[PDB]
Amino acid sequence: FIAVYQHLRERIRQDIIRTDDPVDAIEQMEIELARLTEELTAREQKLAI
Amino acid sequence: IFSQRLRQSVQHYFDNPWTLTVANAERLLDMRDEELALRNEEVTGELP
Amino acid sequence: IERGKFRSLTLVNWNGFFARTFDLDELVTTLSGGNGAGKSTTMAAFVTALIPDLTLLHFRNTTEAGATSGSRDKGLHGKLRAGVCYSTLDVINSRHQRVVVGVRLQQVAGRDRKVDIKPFMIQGLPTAIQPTQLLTENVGERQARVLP
Amino acid sequence: SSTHIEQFMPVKLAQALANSLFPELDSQLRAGRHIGIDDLDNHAFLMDFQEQLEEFYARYNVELIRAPEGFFYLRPRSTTLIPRSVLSELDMMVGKILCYLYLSPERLANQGIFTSQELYEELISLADEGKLMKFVNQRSSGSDLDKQKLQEKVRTTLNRLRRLGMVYFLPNNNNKFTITEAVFRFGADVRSGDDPREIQLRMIRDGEAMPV
Amino acid sequence: FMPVKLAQALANSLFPELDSQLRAGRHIGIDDLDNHAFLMDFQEQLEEFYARYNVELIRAPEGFFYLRPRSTTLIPRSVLSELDMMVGKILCYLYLSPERLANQGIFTSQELYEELISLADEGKLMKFVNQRSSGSDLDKQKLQEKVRTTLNRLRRLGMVYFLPNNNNKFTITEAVFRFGADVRSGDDPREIQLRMIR
Ligand SMILES: Nc1ncnc2c1ncn2[C@@H]1O[C@H](COP(=O)(O)OP(=O)(O)OP(=O)(O)O)[C@@H](O)[C@H]1O
Ligand SMILES: [Mg+2]
């Protein structure tokens, strides 16, 4: 189990996601997913016009 | 969180210097082009 | 409007031709003669003078047509003799202007059978000048020489 | 049946190798170039066929690797069929500084455009100026001539990192440039909060980084 | 899609190694039994495969294969030194008739060193080492070192095969003809080779 956590610790992407606790990083990633979804919605609306 | 993390690393690099690896495939060797030497012969002939 | 036309084709120091000028026709021009006479060579000279891009020129046999072969030899070098060579076209523009385009060809000394090309163009040449005479010097008793 | 692509190769792999973008990308990847998000054509192509390319290059004993920041690159093994090389220590100093620039929100106002002078100033701000000077010239003691030599060496290394894809010059100005996310590989020794020596040993065992 | 025979060819286990060697510029002769046979079998498709890189796959009339880059080559190019072509033309000369009786195909570094020194002009030798040099022992030692270095480069090109021991004795392959002169009807190879070396 310790090995699994050590393995995951390195795989964090950038500063705003640097909660060294992986499980805590999950929700920040999903927050980014939601943010990205909103941006995509606005952009595709622009594309239509 | 990283400010300390990275700044100390730069400060103390030379106590444990390390280097990354990259792919460095070889270049294709080719003949050096010698100065172009054309064939000059001052050809002559009977005109039709 | 009067469309432009190709007046003539000139070859100098090609394989079998020393200095020859074919006068083209307004509609159709035909070349005849036994095998190996030199018809395809005349075709090749024309197209070379039209598109001197040496990366493209590739003169396959009529047999093996359509086969992308990557042959070792493009087949142009052998159609040239040693020394300097020319290939030129005379054209009458829609504006009734006489313009002479062409290329200077020359074999490259060395194991690789390479060729050198240098295009050129002439404008305003008097109608009385023939390219065959313009490209040669009369040395000796009717024994003309080609000039670089 | 016989004479059928599936006999020799997966269809998706053949489809990838037949694409018009493959030769450019293969030539660059073997040269060591890193691929980020900005060059959409190449990055999207890599994402579409990732597993096929990884299985293909495995024949050469090299791993096609994807960093968490989303950039691909090649890491040769010990029995690699493709040669392998290591960066200089000055390259590392400038690389870590470029990373610290990318993170820095105080300079986010620049909107990504940095100047060589700013990079030099930051580098001298953090490192030991005179003792780092030892590598430029063994007799340097702060002379302006030697300072200019340091600046020019920095300029040259920055150009080399441009070839690796770590930085893009502006289309018309070569004195200013924009960063890419690939620079984060310079942080591989600190991204985990643990004992540095064990990190170093794991990196060297994984083939990421050699000593000097 | 992709031609079936091309997919077969590049699926073969020998391809990755041959690709790595070819992109480095190595020449494949009749000596490399398996590689040469592989190229003979799949030339028609490999030529097309490498044309996608703006690089030409040529089979020399003597029989050996090699790649020639165009100006628009997608593979980064590199170029040999003057001393390199000098040594190459020397090796082409040594591929002589009396060679068979003189050495039975196996030469030594000293043969080449002495031939190079004897046949070349002094001025271009100085240009090779350094213009400030003048007939000094250290210059000759440096020239020997450079000869060994360029000979190893040529070995990487496949021109010359070292006999498997630490000593510097080797044999010359047919692919050395790439340095050779143009041949005209009835011309003697010795004379034309010397004419270029002069
Ligand atoms: N590259 C070359 N090298 C050497 N000889 C050549 C070359 N190309 C053509 N020839 C020779 O030049 C002569 C003219 O050939 P060419 O094809 O022009 O003749 P042709 O009258 O068009 O013949 P055909 O109608 O049979 O095609 C022939 O002897 C041919 O063998
Ligand atoms: Mg014909």
**HEC profile of chain E:** CCCHHHHHHHHCCCHHHHHHHHHCCCCECCCCHHHHHHHHHHHHHHHHHHHCCCEEEEECCCCCEEEEECCCCCCCEEECCHHHHHHHHHHHHHCCCCHHHHHCCCEEHHHHHHHHHHHCCHHHHHHHHCCCCCCCHHHHHHHHHHHHHHHHHHHHHCCEEECCCCCCEEEECHHHHHHCCCCCCCCCHHHHHHHHHC
- Report the atom number in ligand 1 closest to the C-alpha of C62: 27
CA nearest to D68 within chain A = A13
Cross-strand bridge partners of residue C12:
C19, C86
Number of neighbouring beta carbons within 10 Å of residue E110? 11
In the numeric block, which tokens belong to residue C34? Answer: 């036994």
**What are the C-alpha distances in Å from D131 to residues B6, D92, D111, D137, E73?**
20, 16, 33, 11, 44
Phi, psi angles (nearest 5°) of residue D81: -85, -10
Which CATH number is D5-76 given? 1.10.10.2250
DSSP strand E in D32-147: where? 62-66, 72-76, 84-86, 113-115
In eight-state DSSP terms, residue D178 is E
Distance between CA D162 and CA D183 in Å, rounded?
11
Q: Which residues, at least 6 apart from D36, have a Cβ–Cβ distance to it below 8 Å?
A: D43, D70, D71, D165, D180, D181, D182
In eight-state DSSP terms, residue C2 is P
**What are the C-alpha distances in Å from C106 to residues C55, C76, E51?**
16, 11, 27
Partner-chain residue, chosen from B25, B27, B34, that has the shortest CB–CB distance to E77: B27
Four-residue CA torsion sign, C88, E70, D22, E29: positive
* Chain B / chain C CB contacts < 8 angstroms: 55
C-alpha angle with apex E194: E188 to E198, nearest 5 degrees? 145
Q: Cβ distance D91 to D160 under 8 Å?
A: yes
Q: Which residues, at least 6 apart from E163, have a Cβ–Cβ distance to it below 8 Å?
A: E106, E169, E170, E171
* Exposure b/e, E4-19, CB count within 10 A at least 16 = b: bebbbbbeeeebbebb
Cross-strand bridge partners of residue E108:
E169
Number of neighbouring beta carbons within 10 Å of residue E48? 14
For residue B29, give the 3-state DSSP assignment. Answer: strand
In the numeric block, which tokens belong to residue C11? Answer: 């070859």
Q: Cβ distance D182 to D188 under 8 Å?
A: no
Cross-strand bridge partners of residue E161:
E171
In the numeric block, which tokens belong to residue C26? Answer: 């307004």
Place of tokens 């409007």: C1
Using a CB-CB cut-off of 8 Å, the residues of chain B touching A18 are 1-2
In eight-state DSSP terms, residue D174 is S
Distance between CA C132 and CA C50 in Å, rounded?
19
Cross-strand bridge partners of residue E151:
none
For residue C39, give the 3-state DSSP assignment. Answer: helix
**Numbered ranges of CATH 1.10.10.2250 in chain E:** 1-69
Asked how this structure was determined, the answer is cryo-EM
Distance between CA C10 and CA C24 in Å, rounded?
11
In eight-state DSSP terms, residue C130 is -
Distance between CA E36 and CA E28 in Å, rounded?
6
Distance between CA D29 and CA D72 in Å, rounded?
9
What is the end-to-end Cα distance of chain D in Å, rounded? 55
Q: Cβ distance C145 to B47 under 8 Å?
A: no
Give the distance from residue E141's alpha carbon to the nearest chain C alpha carbon, in angstroms. Answer: 33
- For residue C4, say whether it is annotated as part of any ligand binding site: no
Helices E189-197 and E82-94 sit at what angle, rounded to 10 degrees? 160
Q: Is it true that domain D89-187 has CATH number 1.10.10.2260?
A: yes
User: Strands D113-115 and D176-179, how do they pair?
Assistant: antiparallel
**Numbered ranges of CATH 1.10.10.2250 in chain D:** 5-76
Which CATH number is E82-180 given? 1.10.10.2260
Rg of chain E on CA atoms, in Å:
19
For residue D188, give the 3-state DSSP assignment. Answer: coil
Distance between CA E152 and CA E162 in Å, rounded?
9
Number of neighbouring beta carbons within 10 Å of residue C9? 21
- Determine which helix (DSSP H) or strand (DSSP E) holds D83, and give its type and residue range: none
Q: Cβ distance E61 to E162 under 8 Å?
A: no
Cα E90 → chain centroid: 11
- For residue C34, say whether it is annotated as part of any ligand binding site: yes
Query: Which of D114, D94, D85, D121 lies closest to D209, judged by CA?
Result: D85
Q: Which residues of C touch B (CB under 8 A)?
A: 13, 18-20, 81-84, 106-110, 116, 132, 136, 139-140, 142-146, 148
DSSP strand E in D27-175: where? 62-66, 72-76, 84-86, 113-115, 167-169
For residue D204, give the 3-state DSSP assignment. Answer: helix
Test site for ligand 1: of C17, C22, C31, C40, most ligand atoms within 8 A of the Cβ: C40
Number of neighbouring beta carbons within 10 Å of residue D203? 18
For residue C19, give the 3-state DSSP assignment. Answer: strand
Number of neighbouring beta carbons within 10 Å of residue C58? 14
Nominal resolution in Å?
3.7
Distance between CA A3 and CA A9 in Å, rounded?
10
**Numbered ranges of CATH 1.10.10.2260 in chain D:** 89-187
Calculate the CA dihedral of residues D36, D39, D45, D51 and round it to 10 degrees: -10
Phi, psi angles (nearest 5°) of residue B38: -85, 170
User: Strands E77-79 and B28-30, how do they pair?
Assistant: parallel
Are D32 and B11 within 8 A, CB to CB?
A: no
Place of tokens 């006479």: C37
- Determine which helix (DSSP H) or strand (DSSP E) holds C90, and give its type and residue range: strand C84-92
Residue C37: CB within 6 Å of ligand 1? yes
- Determine which helix (DSSP H) or strand (DSSP E) holds C5, and give its type and residue range: strand C5-14
Distance between CA E28 and CA E158 in Å, rounded?
7
For residue D11, give the 3-state DSSP assignment. Answer: helix
Sequence letter at residue D38: D
Query: Which of D75, D70, D22 lies closest to D47, judged by CA?
Result: D70
Chains E vs A: touching, with 3+ CB pairs under 8 Å?
A: no
C-alpha angle with apex C75: E19 to C8, nearest 5 degrees? 140
| Secondary-structure percent of chain B, ordered helix, strand, coil, rounded to 5 | 25, 25, 50
Sequence letter at residue E29: G
**What are the C-alpha distances in Å from D52 to residues D3, D15, D58, D145, E31?**
22, 10, 10, 53, 35
Helical spans, DSSP H, in C1-147: 39-50, 131-134
Place of tokens 């606790």: A21
Distance between CA D159 and CA D166 in Å, rounded?
10
In eight-state DSSP terms, residue D35 is B
Sequence letter at residue E85: M
Q: Cβ distance B10 to D122 under 8 Å?
A: no
CATH class of E1-69: mainly alpha
Are E180 and C72 within 8 A, CB to CB?
A: no
Query: Which of E17, E42, E59, E23 lies closest to D23, judged by CA?
Result: E23
Residue C74: CB within 6 Å of ligand 1? no
Distance between CA D41 and CA D20 in Å, rounded?
11
Phi, psi angles (nearest 5°) of residue D178: -125, 140
Q: How many residues does chain C have?
A: 148
Q: Cβ distance D208 to D188 under 8 Å?
A: yes
